[PDB]
Amino acid sequence: VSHDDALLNTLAILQKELKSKEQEIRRLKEVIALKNKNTERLNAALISGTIENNVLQQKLSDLKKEHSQLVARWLK
C-alpha cells in the first residue's frame, strides 16, 4: 500500500532472526563446554574401570593357584 514498509518489515524479521541466532551460538558453545566436562569424567571412569577389572582378573588368577596348591596338600 505504501513506501518503505516492505523494507521495514523485512529488516524487522531479519533483525529478530539475527538475535535469535546469536543466542543459539552462545548455547551451543555452552553445550560444548558441558559435553567436554562430561567427556573427561567418562574418560576417568572408563580408565579406572578398565584398570580395575584387569586387577580383579589378576587376583582371581592368583587365588586360583593358591587354592589349587592348598588342595594339593591333601596329597601328603
Place this chain on the structure above:
Amino acid sequence: GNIVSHDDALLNTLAILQKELKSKEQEIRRLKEVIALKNKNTERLNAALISGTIENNVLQQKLSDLKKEHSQLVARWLKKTEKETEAM
C-alpha cells in the same frame, strides 16, 4: 536526498544483515557438527563404560565367591591338621 539518504541507509543495513545471517548460520552448522561428534563419542564411551561396569560386578562376585570357598578349605585343612596332630 532526505528520504533517499534514509532508504540508502536501510538498504545498507539490510545488505549487512543478510551477510551476518548467512555467516552466523554457517557457524551454527559448524558448532552443531562438533557437538554431534562429541555425542557420537560420548555414546561409544557410555557403551564401553556400562559394559565394563557389568563385567566388573561379575568379577567382584567371582572373586568373592572364590574367596569364601578358599576359606572353607583353609579351615577344613586346619580341622584336618588339628586332628592329625592331636590323634598322633
